[PDB]
Short mmCIF file of C-alpha atoms and ligand atoms in Angstrom, two decimals:
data_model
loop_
_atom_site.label_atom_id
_atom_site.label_comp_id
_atom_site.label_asym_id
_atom_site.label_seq_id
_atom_site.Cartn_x
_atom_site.Cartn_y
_atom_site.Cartn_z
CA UNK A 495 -14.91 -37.23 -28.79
CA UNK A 496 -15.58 -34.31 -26.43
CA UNK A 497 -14.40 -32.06 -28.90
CA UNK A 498 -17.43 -32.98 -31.35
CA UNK A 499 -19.66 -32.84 -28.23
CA UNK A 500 -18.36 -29.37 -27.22
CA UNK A 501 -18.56 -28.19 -30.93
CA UNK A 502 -22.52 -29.81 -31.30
CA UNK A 503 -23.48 -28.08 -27.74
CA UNK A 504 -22.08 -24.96 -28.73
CA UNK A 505 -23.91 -24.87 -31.92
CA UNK A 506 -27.37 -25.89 -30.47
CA UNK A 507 -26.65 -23.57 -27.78
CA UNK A 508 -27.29 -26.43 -25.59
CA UNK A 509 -25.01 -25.61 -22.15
CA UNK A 510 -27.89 -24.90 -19.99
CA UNK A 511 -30.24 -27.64 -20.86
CA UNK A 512 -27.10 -29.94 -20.56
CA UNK A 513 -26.09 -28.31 -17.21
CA UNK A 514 -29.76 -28.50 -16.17
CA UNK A 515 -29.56 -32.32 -17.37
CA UNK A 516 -27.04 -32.69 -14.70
CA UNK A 517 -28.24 -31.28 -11.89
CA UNK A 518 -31.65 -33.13 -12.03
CA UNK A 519 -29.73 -36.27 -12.67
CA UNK A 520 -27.51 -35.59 -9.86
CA UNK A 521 -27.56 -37.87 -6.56
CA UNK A 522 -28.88 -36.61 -3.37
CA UNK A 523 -27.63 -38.69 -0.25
CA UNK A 524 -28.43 -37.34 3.25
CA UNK A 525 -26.76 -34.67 5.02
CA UNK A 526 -28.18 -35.60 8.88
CA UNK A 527 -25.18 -34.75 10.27
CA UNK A 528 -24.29 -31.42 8.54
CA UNK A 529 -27.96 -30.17 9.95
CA UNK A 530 -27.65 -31.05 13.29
CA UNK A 531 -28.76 -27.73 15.43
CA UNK A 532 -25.12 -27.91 17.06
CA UNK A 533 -23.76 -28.25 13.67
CA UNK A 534 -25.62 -24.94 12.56
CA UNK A 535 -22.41 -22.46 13.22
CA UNK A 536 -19.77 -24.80 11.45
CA UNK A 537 -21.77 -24.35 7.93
CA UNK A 538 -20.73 -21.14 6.22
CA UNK A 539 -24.29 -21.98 3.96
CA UNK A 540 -27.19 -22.99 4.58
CA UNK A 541 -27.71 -24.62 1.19
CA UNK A 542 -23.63 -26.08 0.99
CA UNK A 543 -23.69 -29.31 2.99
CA UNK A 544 -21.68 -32.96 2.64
CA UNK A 545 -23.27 -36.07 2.63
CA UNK A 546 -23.15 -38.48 5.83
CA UNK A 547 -21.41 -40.77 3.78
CA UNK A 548 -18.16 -39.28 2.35
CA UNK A 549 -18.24 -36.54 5.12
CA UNK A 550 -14.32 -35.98 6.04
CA UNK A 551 -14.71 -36.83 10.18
CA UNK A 552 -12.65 -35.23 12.58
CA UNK A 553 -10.35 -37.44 14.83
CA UNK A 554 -11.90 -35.68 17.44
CA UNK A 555 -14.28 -36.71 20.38
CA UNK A 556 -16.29 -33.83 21.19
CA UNK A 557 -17.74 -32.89 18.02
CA UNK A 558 -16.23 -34.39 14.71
CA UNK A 559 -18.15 -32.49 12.06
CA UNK A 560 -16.96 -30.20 9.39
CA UNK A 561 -18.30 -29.51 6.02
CA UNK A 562 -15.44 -31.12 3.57
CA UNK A 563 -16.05 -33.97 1.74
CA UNK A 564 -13.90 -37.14 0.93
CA UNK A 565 -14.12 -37.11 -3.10
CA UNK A 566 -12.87 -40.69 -4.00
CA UNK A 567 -12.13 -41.00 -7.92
CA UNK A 568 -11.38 -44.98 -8.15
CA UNK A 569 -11.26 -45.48 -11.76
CA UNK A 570 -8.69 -42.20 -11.78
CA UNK A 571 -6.77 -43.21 -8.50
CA UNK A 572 -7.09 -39.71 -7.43
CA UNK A 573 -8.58 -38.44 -3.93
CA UNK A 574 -9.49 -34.86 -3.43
CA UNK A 575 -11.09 -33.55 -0.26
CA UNK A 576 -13.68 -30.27 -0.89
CA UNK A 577 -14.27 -28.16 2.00
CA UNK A 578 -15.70 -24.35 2.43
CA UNK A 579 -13.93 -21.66 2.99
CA UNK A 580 -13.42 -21.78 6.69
CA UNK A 581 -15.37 -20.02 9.37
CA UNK A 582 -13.82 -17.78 11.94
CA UNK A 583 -14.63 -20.84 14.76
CA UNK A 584 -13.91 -23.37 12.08
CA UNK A 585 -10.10 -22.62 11.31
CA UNK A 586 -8.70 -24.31 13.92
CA UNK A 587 -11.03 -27.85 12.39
CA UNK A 588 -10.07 -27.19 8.95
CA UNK A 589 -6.12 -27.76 10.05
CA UNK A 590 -6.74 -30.29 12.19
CA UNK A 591 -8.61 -32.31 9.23
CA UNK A 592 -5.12 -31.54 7.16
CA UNK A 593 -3.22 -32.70 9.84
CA UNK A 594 -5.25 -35.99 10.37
CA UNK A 595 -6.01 -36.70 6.68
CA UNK A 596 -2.22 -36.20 5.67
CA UNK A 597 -2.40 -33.96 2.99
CA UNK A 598 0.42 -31.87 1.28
CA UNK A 599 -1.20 -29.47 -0.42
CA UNK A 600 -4.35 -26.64 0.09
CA UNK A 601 -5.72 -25.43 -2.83
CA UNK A 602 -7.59 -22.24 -2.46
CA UNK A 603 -9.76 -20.84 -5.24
CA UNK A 604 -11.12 -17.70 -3.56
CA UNK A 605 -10.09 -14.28 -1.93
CA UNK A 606 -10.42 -13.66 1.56
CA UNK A 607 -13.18 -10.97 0.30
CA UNK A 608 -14.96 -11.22 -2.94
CA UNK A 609 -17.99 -8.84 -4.28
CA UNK A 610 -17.58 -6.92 -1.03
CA UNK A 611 -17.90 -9.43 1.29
CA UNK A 612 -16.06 -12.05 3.47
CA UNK A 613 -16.03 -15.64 1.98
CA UNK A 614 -13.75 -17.06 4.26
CA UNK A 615 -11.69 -16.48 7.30
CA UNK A 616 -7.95 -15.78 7.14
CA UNK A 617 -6.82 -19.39 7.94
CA UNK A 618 -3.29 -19.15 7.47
CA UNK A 619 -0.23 -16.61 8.53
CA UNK A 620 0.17 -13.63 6.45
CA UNK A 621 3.06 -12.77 7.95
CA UNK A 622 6.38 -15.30 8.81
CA UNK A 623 6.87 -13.37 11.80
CA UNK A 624 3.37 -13.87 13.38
CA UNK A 625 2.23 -17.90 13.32
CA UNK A 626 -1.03 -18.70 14.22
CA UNK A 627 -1.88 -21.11 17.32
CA UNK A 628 -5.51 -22.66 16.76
CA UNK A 629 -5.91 -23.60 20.67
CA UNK A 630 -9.20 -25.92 20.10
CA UNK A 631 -7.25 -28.21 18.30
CA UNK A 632 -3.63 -27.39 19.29
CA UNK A 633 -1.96 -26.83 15.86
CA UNK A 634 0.27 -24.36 15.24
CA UNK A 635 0.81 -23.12 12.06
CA UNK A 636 3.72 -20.42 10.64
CA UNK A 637 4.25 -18.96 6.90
CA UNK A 638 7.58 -20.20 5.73
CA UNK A 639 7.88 -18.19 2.35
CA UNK A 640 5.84 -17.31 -0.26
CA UNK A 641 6.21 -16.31 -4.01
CA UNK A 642 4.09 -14.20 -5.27
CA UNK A 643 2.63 -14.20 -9.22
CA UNK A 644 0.34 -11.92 -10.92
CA UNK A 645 -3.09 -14.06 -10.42
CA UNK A 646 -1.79 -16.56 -7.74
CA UNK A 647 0.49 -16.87 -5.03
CA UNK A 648 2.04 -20.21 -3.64
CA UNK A 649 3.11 -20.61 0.15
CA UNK A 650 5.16 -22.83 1.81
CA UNK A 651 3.85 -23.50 5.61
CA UNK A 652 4.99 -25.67 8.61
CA UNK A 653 2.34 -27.44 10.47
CA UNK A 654 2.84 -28.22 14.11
CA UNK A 655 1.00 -30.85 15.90
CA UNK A 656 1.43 -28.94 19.56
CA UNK A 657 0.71 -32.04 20.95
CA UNK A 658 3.30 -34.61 19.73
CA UNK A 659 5.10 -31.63 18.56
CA UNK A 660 6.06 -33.28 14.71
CA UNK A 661 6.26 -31.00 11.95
CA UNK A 662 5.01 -30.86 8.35
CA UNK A 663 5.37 -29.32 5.32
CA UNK A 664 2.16 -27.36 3.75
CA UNK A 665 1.87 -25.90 0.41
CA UNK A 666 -0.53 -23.55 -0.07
CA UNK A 667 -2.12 -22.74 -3.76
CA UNK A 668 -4.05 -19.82 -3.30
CA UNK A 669 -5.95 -19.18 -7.20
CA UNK A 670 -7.25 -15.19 -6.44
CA UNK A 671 -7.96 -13.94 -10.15
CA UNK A 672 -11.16 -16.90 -10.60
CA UNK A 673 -14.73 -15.41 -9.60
CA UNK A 674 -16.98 -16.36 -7.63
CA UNK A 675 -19.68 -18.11 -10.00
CA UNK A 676 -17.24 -17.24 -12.70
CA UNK A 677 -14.52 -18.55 -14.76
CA UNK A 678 -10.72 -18.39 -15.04
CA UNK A 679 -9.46 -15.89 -17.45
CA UNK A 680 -7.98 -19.05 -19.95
CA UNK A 681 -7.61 -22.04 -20.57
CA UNK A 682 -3.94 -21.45 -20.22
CA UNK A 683 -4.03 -19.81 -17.18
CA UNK A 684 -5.66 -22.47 -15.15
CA UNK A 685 -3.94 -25.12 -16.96
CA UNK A 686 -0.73 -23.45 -15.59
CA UNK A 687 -2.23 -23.38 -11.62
CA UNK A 688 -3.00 -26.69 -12.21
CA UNK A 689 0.00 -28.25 -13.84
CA UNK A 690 1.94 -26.13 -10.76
CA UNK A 691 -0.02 -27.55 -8.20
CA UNK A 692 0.67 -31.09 -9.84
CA UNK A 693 4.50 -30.43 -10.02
CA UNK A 694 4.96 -29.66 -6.55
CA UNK A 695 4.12 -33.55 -5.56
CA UNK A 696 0.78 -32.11 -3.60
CA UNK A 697 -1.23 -35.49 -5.47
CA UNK A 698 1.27 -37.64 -5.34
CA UNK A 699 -0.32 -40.97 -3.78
CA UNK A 700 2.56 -41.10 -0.91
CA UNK A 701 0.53 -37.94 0.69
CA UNK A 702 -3.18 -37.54 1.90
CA UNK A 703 -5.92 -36.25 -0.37
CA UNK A 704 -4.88 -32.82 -1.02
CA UNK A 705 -7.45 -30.10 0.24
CA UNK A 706 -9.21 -28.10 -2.69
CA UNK A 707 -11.36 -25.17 -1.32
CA UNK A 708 -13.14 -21.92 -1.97
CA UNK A 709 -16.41 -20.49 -0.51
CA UNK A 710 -18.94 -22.95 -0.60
CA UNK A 711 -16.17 -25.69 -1.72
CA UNK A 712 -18.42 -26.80 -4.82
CA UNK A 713 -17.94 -24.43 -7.72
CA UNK A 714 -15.00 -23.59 -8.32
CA UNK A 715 -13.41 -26.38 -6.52
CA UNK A 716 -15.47 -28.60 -8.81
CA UNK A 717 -14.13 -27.23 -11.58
CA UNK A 718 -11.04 -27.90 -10.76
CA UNK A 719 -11.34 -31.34 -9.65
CA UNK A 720 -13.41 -32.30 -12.59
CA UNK A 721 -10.49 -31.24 -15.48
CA UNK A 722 -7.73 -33.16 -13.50
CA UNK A 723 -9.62 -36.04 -12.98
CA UNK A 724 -10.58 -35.60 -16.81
CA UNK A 725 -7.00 -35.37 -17.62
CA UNK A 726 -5.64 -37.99 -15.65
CA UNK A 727 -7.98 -41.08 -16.62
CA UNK A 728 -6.79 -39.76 -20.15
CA UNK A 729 -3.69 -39.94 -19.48
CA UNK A 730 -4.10 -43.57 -18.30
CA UNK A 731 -4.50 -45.24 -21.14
CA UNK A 732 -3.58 -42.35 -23.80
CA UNK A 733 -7.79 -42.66 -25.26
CA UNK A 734 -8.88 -39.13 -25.11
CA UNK A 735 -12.35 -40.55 -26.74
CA UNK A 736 -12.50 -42.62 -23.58
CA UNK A 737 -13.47 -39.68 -21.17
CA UNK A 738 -17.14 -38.73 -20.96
CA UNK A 739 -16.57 -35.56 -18.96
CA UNK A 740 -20.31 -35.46 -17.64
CA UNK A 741 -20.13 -38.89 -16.72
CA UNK A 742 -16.73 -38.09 -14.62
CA UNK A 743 -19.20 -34.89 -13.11
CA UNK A 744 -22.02 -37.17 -11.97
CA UNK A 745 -19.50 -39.42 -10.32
CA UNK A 746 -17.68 -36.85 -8.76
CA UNK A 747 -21.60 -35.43 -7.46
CA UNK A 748 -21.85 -39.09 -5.37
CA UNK A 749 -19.53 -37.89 -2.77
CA UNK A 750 -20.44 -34.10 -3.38
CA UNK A 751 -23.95 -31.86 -3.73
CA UNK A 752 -23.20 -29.00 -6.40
CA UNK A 753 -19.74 -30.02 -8.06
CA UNK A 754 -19.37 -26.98 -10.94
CA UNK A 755 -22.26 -24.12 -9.96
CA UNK A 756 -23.03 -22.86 -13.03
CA UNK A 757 -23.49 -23.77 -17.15
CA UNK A 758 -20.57 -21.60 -18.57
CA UNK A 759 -18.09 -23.42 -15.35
CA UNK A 760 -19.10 -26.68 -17.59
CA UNK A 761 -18.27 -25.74 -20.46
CA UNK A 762 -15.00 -23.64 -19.16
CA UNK A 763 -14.33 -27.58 -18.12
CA UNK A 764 -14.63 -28.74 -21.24
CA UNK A 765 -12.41 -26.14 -22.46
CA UNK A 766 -9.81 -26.92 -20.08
CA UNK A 767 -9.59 -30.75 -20.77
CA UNK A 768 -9.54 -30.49 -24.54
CA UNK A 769 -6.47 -27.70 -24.74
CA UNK A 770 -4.79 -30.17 -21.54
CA UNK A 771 -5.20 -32.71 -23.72
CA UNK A 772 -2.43 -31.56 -26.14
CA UNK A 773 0.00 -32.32 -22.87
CA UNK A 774 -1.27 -35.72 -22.25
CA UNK A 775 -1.33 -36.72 -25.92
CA UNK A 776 2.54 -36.15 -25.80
CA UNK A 777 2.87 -32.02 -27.09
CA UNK A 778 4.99 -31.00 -23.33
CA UNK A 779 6.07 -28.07 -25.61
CA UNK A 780 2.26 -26.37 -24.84
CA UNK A 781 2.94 -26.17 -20.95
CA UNK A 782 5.66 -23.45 -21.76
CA UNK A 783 3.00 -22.04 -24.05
CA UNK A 784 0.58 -21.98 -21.47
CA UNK A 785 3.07 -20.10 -18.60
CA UNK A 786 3.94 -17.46 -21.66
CA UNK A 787 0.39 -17.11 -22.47
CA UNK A 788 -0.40 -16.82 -18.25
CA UNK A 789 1.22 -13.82 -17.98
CA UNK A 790 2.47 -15.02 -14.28
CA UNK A 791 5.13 -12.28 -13.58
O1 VO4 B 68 -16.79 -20.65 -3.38
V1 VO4 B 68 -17.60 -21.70 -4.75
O2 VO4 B 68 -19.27 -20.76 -4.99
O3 VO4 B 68 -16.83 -21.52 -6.49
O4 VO4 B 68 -18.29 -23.42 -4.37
#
């Protein structure tokens, strides 16, 4: 039970040797690719790369790196792929790996700027009137609506393939209340994002893996990943003692470096997948509980 586990950790004030455990137990797979000298402009971090061998690869022939990795939960039937936050020369990759990977949904944990700086580029329209053409890879992109709540904002976008001029539909999940190296305000209020990002169909297995993002693509996106994995092998069989939650972490790590960033993100996890497991153990009454407690208007 990782209730009795959270409980003992907390008591020992364990988190950091755990988290520690992790990280030294963690795999390490190459990156040759990532560190080519021609791939040196398409990192955002030095320190932030995929592995060779669950790198996302562009459909492209003149260079077909980018750093997103192809996170491939087989147990939980669930696919995510983690990217950074896009580079100003980058943008124009990043859609064209959404286009050729078939995804539905963008999840995006970060704000444009954070702690003063730029994290990411401004990779999709702010404005319906003004689309974006990314001419390297010959997407267009326009904002179809948006709606707007008081820590997150969710965007509908059309995707244009330029080329064979087809169409899809994007949503976009933008999180922009969850720090950098931090943690979500509650329980409850990432609970919500995520239950809304699983009600719009975004990881349904008729689409692509959807796209989870935010700076580096390993923090906060782990986080993230991590619960709903969590909560969906629960909800397989309906065994919430079946889950070991750092097992499901050091899994995740084989297709990632750095999944979760710091000790207090692990436990925040923990926290997550215990109160989501009142939904999966058949309470749906708490997801109204969790908007109300959100705040989200
Ligand atoms: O932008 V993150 O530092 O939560 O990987």
């Amino acid at each position: 039970e990782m209730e009795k586990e959270f409980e003992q950790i907390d008591k020992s004030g364990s988190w950091a040797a755990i988290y520690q455990d992790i990280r030294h137990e963690a795999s390490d797979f190459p990156c040759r690719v990532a560190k080519l000298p021609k791939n040196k402009n398409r990192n955002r971090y030095r320190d932030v790369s995929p592995f060779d061998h669950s790198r996302i690869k562009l459909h492209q022939e003149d260079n077909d790196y980018i750093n997103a990795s192809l996170i491939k939960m087989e147990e939980a039937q669930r696919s995510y792929i983690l990217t950074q936050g896009p580079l100003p020369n980058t943008c124009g990759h990043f859609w064209e790996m959404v286009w050729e990977q078939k995804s539905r949904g963008v999840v995006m944990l970060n704000r444009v700027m954070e702690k003063g700086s730029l994290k990411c580029a401004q990779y999709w329209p702010q404005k319906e009137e003004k689309e974006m053409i990314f001419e390297d890879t010959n997407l267009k992109l326009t904002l179809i609506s948006e709606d707007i709540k008081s820590y997150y904002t969710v965007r509908q976008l059309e995707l244009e393939n330029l080329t064979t001029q087809e169409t899809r539909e994007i949503l976009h999940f933008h999180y922009t209340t969850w720090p950098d190296a931090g943690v979500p305000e509650s329980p409850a209020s990432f609970l919500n994002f995520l239950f809304k990002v699983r009600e719009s169909g975004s990881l349904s297995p008729e689409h692509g893996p959807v796209v989870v993002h935010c700076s580096a693509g390993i923090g906060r996106s782990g986080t993230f990943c991590l619960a709903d994995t969590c909560l969906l092998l629960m909800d397989k069989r309906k065994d919430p003692s079946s889950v070991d939650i750092k097992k499901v972490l050091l899994e995740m790590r084989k297709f990632r470096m750095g999944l979760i960033q710091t000790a207090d993100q692990l436990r925040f996890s923990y926290l997550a997948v215990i109160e989501g497991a009142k939904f999966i153990m058949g309470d749906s009454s708490v997801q109204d509980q969790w908007k109300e407690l959100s705040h989200e208007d």
